[PDB]
């Protein structure tokens, strides 16, 4: 559906086919894996679908649906903050490119109001949405989108180009005051500081310097180039293209996809565990690029023309079959291994744990390293 | 044409059945080769928290 909102239904089918077997998503969602990501990355796409349907159409109902699914993500995973900073950013860009409308006001204000009041109901989140830096971008775009709308009312009556820089200067002034306000508030101690992992995504050397437990877990490390292939074969070269093709024909949906792509490519490079969040956009981008190629080379509607169309389409169909094979092999070889039983079977872990369960006192306490706490 | 729309609708239904099959089949290697067990470290805790929900109540969870 999300791709069907950016180009056509054919590109949507390609995107769904890609995401179904893509090793990058498969890695954190194999049968047995029961972490938060399993359902989380599903809710993310649903939320994004409703947001785009709400932003292009301009409807209150779809913005409410987006808000409710955003609440579901807030209640499910801890990486909801990505949405909290991606939906405002898209809106902010749309203000700067001059593409403000009333559909934008309606969609964003309804999503923000319902989503924020509903995401303060999870006990873990508490009052973070109103007093934490990570959730302040949204609040900025909430206030800003109200000056701009007044702008429009007071664009029409001035009825001249005096208003052009009359608007620009006002924008700069507000933009400056707010960041200073945040800084001042943050220094005073009212607004909380950027969390201790999000800062690490900018100050790459910060983790080791202060937090010594974040730099021991393998998950939070950079990735070498081979991994961006082992996980999204063929799609990885075809994604940067799709981004350019979506850039030649800017629409609001495309502005969204472009921002998503840039930010997640940076984050995925800087940290391994954030590759999963990049896998959906890659599929969508690949789906656009291949679909565009197909649209110029599958419509058989002349020896040279037929020969060229067949050679091009056949090459890409070959790459699609190669994709299926590569993905299945990768899934079998690397991402399907159980952890409790090392293949030889070596059953030492379960054997020891069961001994501890059967031949020890029910109230006894076991002192081991943190890595094996949950398993015990 | 109505015929072309009907064809497209049926084709999409069949394509989606194929997609669901592909996804589940690719995901079941570990469950077919060893057994149905929870894998990794965090899922273990998640499993415990679900057995506590399912066995007591939503309020006590």
């Amino acid at each position: 559906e999300f791709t069907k909102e950016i180009k056509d239904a054919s590109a949507g089918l390609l995107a769904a086919g890609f995401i179904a077997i893509v090793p990058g998503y498969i890695s954190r969602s194999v049968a047995g894996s029961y972490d938060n990501e399993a359902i989380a990355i599903t809710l993310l796409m649903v939320t994004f679908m409703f947001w785009i349907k709400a932003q292009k159409t301009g409807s209150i109902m779809h913005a409410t649906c987006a808000a409710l699914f955003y609440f579901y993500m807030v209640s499910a995973w801890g990486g909801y903050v990505f949405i909290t900073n991606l939906i405002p950013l898209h809106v902010f860009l749309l203000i700067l490119m001059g593409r403000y409308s009333s559909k934008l006001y309606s969609a964003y204000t309804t999503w923000y109001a319902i989503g924020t009041v509903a995401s303060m109901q999870i006990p873990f989140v508490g009052f973070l949405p109103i007093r934490s830096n990570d959730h302040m971008a949204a609040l900025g775009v909430f206030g800003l989108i109200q000056i701009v709308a007044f702008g429009d009312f007071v664009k029409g009556q001035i009825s001249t180009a005096k208003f052009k820089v009359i608007m620009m200067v006002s924008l700069f002034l507000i933009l400056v005051l707010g960041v200073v306000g945040l800084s001042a508030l943050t220094y005073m101690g009212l607004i909380a500081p950027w969390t201790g992992r999000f800062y690490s995504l900018w100050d790459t050397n910060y983790a080791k310097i202060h937090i010594p437990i974040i730099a021991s877990v393998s998950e939070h490390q950079p990735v070498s180039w081979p991994a961006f292939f082992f996980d999204t074969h063929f799609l990885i070269w075809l994604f940067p293209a799709g981004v350019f093709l979506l850039f030649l024909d800017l629409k609001d949906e495309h502005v969204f996809v472009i921002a998503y792509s840039v930010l997640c490519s940076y984050f995925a490079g800087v940290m391994v565990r954030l590759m999963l969040t990049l896998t959906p956009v890659i599929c969508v981008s690949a789906a656009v690029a291949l679909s565009k190629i197909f649209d110029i080379y599958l419509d058989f509607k002349k020896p040279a023309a037929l020969l060229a169309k067949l050679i091009v389409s056949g090459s890409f169909i070959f790459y699609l079959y190669l994709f299926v094979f590569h993905s299945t092999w990768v899934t079998r070889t690397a991402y399907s291994s159980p952890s409790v039983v090392l293949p030889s079977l070596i059953d030492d872990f379960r054997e020891a744990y069961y001994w501890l369960r059967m031949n020890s006192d029910e109230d006894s306490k076991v002192a081991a390293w943190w890595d094996y706490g949950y398993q015990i | 044409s109505c015929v072309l729309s009907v064809f497209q609708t049926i084709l999409k239904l069949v394509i989606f059945v194929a997609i669901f099959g592909a996804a589940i089949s690719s995901r079941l290697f570990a469950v077919i080769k060893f057994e149905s067990i929870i894998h990794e470290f965090d899922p273990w805790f998640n499993y415990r928290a679900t057995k506590y929900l399912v066995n007591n109540s939503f309020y006590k969870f």
Partner: peptide, 6 residues
């Protein structure tokens, strides 16, 4: 990749 010490 998992929540474990390297």
């Amino acid at each position: 990749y998992a929540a474990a010490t390297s």
